Amino acid sequence: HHHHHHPIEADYLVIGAGIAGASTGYWLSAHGRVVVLEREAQPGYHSTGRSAAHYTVAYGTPQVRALTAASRAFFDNPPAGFCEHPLLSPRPEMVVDFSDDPEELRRQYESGKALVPQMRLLDAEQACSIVPVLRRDKVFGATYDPTGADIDTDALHQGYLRGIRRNQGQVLCNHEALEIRRVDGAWEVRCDAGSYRAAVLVNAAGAWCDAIAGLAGVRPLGLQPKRRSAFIFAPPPGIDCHDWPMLVSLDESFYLKPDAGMLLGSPANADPVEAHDVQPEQLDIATGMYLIEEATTLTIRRPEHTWAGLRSFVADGDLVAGYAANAEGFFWVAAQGGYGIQTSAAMGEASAALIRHQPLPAHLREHGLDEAMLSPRRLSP
Numbered sequence: 001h002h003h004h005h006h007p008i009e010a011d012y013l014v015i016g017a018g019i020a021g022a023s024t025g026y027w028l029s030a031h032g033r034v035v036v037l038e039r040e041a042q043p044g045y046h047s048t049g050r051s052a053a054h055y056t057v058a059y060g061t062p063q064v065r066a067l068t069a070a071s072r073a074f075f076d077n078p079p080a081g082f083c084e085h086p087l088l089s090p091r092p093e094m095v096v097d098f099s100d101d102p103e104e105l106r107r108q109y110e111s112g113k114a115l116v117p118q119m120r121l122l123d124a125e126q127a128c129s130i131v132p133v134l135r136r137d138k139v140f141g142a143t144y145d146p147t148g149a150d151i152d153t154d155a156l157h158q159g160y161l162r163g164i165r166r167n168q169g170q171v172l173c174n175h176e177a178l179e180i181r182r183v184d185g186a187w188e189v190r191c192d193a194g195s196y197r198a199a200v201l202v203n204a205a206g207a208w209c210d211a212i213a214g215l216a217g218v219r220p221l222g223l224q225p226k227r228r229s230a231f232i233f234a235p236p237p238g239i240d241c242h243d244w245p246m247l248v249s250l251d252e253s254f255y256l257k258p259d260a261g262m263l264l265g266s267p268a269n270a271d272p273v274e275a276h277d278v279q280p281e282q283l284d285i286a287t288g289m290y291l292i293e294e295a296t297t298l299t300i301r302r303p304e305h306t307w308a309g310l311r312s313f314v315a316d317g318d319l320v321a322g323y324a325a326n327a328e329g330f331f332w333v334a335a336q337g338g339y340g341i342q343t344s345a346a347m348g349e350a351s352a353a354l355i356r357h358q359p360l361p362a363h364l365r366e367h368g369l370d371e372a373m374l375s376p377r378r379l380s381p
């Protein structure tokens with residue numbers, strides 16, 4: 001009995017306009033009618049706006065590393081007109097052993113060197129030369145990846161979204177998917193002003209992907225959102241930290257990285273929580289500050305910014321890009337974990353190809369990706 005617009009027909013409905021939905025929609029948009037439906041008033045209010053903005057190849061499971069490695073080409077060399085400035089800026093990563101665990105440090109070095117030939121094993125003195133506020137007594141060695149980079153996430157995200165629009169796709173904010181139903185051979189999504197129909201439902205809803213499956217009556221994946229907080233603080237007078245690498249402890253207990261003229265810190269946490277608009281917890285912030293003040297000579301007065309976001313995982317830690325078993329037309333773009341920005345070019349390209357029943361592009365295959373390792377089917381026997 002309330003008015004709705006006449007239904008809108010498309011080829012692919014993408015639920016969520018974060019990095020996942022934007023990247024998938026970008027690669028779909030040249031091929032068919034894309035409509036991206038986003039709940040919030042802006043597309044990057046949730047995890048995509050909350051990351052450390054870093055590109056780290058030796059990070060996550062083997063699949064993650066392959067997706068990250070395969071994304072670099074696009075980030076370094078995107079198509080003419082995608083963006084106005086470079087997407088990456090140089091930011092090596094230094095993983096420091098604060099634990100005195102030389103067996104683990106050597107494992108991570110060998111693992112990383114196999115992927116990144118330029119990876120180096122540092123002694124404690126070398127680590128302390130690179131970040132001179134380190135407490136030498138607390139440092140037992142490090143790895144150093146000269147190939148790490150910071151990502152201009154807003155430029156990347158907006159570039160994907162703009163590409164959709166330039167291909168006559170629609171990016172609709174304030175369009176929460178409220179109901180999802182298979183109707184007359186298509187998925188039909190009800191938003192508050194009208195409905196949308198397409199043969200393909202692309203579920204790119206971040207921490208809410210299982211909620212979207214719930215609307216649709218599709219078996220969920222078991223996605224677990226995990227809170228990570230971060231904060232920005234001023235360096236002490238006299239500390240020119242602008243060119244420091246990203247500094248991470250070997251057991252991922254904290255990290256520290258320059259952000260412009262400030263410092264980004266984090267306790268690098270992964271506290272399991274439900275999907276929601278997550279806020280930083282005081283204990284998270286206090287813990288990250290404590291660990292930084294223990295590992296270094298820095299003193300942290302009071303943060304300029306604090307926030308938290310959700311890093312969402314399935315049980316094996318790998319991302320998901322594939323059609324749901326026994327749910328025609330329902331395509332998962334999920335479980336981005338701690339890696340959704342740095343994997344987005346490969347994930348966007350792979351997911352769009354698979355949605356369109358195309359083989360994965362060679363360059364992706366050559367990084368050792370295939371359909372099966374991306375599929376949600378692997379989570380079950």
Ligand SMILES: Cc1cc2c(cc1C)N(C(=O)CC(C)C)c1c([nH]c(=O)[nH]c1=O)N2C[C@H](O)[C@H](O)[C@H](O)COP(=O)(O)OP(=O)(O)OC[C@H]1O[C@@H](n2cnc3c(N)ncnc32)[C@H](O)[C@@H]1O
Binds near residue numbers: 019204312336
């Ligand atoms: C927090 C957090 C996260 C990272 C790092 C730090 C912190 C502190 N971070 C590191 O700590 C690295 C170390 C090495 C330093 C680094 C990260 N990722 C990197 O690649 N690089 C990093 O440096 N991450 C993970 C990335 O942040 C993370 O992997 C990536 O951002 C995930 O992107 P999605 O696209 O999957 O998720 P969205 O939430 O954006 O978008 C979903 C949208 O869906 C909508 N939506 C939902 N429901 C509906 C309905 N009903 N209807 C309609 N619409 C609906 C909803 O409103 C959203 O807008």
